[PDB]
Design a protein around this ligand. Structure first.
Ligand SMILES: O=S1(=O)CC[C@@]2(CCCN(c3ncnc4[nH]ccc34)C2)C1
Length: 167
């Protein structure tokens, strides 16, 4: 038994809720929150900018030190850093950027990072809101992640669409 509340069950191990991941993190304080990162750990908008803002920029300060030491992540890769005031740990995961021409198959590699953690609070990666992109993003999550993942979907029309379309 864990502390996540109000989630719909998609499969044995995947749960979903129309929620803002930042509000979910503050309320639950999970062991792992996933950030939808870029390779530079530049947290400007979306999940990353909102998580970072909620840490009062401490996530960005830690991230810049990480990059200065280690260089950029790989697309499809990840690193574990502090969760600051939001979680014990933040797993920064880089999904492919299709508007950069980055291979859509890297999305499966990105989700494979989740399997190194028993339970995670996470957003959809390389999904966005419009088109078939988000549907297929959740399809890859379900078919790749084997650990217990609690998905917070910010857009309610998208949440409703995902639940109603999920096979
Ligand atoms: O939900 S979406 O339509 C699926 C793709 C999307 C892109 C923007 C950032 N998103 C978030 N997801 C969950 N919590 C969030 N808090 C702040 C942003 C955010 C994910 C929106």
């Amino acid at each position: 038994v864990n502390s996540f509340s109000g989630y719909l069950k998609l499969t044995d191990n995947v749960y979903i809720k129309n929620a803002d991941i930042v509000e979910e993190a503050k309320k639950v304080k999970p062991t792992v929150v996933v950030n939808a990162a870029n390779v530079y750990l530049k947290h400007g908008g979306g999940v990353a900018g909102a998580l970072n803002k909620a840490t009062n920029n401490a996530m960005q300060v830690e991230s810049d030190d990480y990059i200065a030491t280690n260089g950029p992540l790989k697309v499809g890769g990840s690193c574990v850093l502090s969760g600051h005031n939001l979680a014990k740990h933040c797993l920064h995961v880089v999904g492919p950027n299709v508007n950069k021409g980055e291979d859509i198959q890297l999305l499966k590699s990105a989700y494979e990072n989740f399997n190194q953690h028993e339970v995670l609070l996470a957003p959809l990666l390389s999904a966005g809101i419009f088109g078939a992109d988000p549907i297929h993003s959740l399809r890859v999550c379900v078919d790749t992640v084997r650990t217990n993942v609690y998905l917070a979907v910010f857009d309610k029309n998208l949440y409703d669409k995902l639940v109603s379309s999920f096979l």
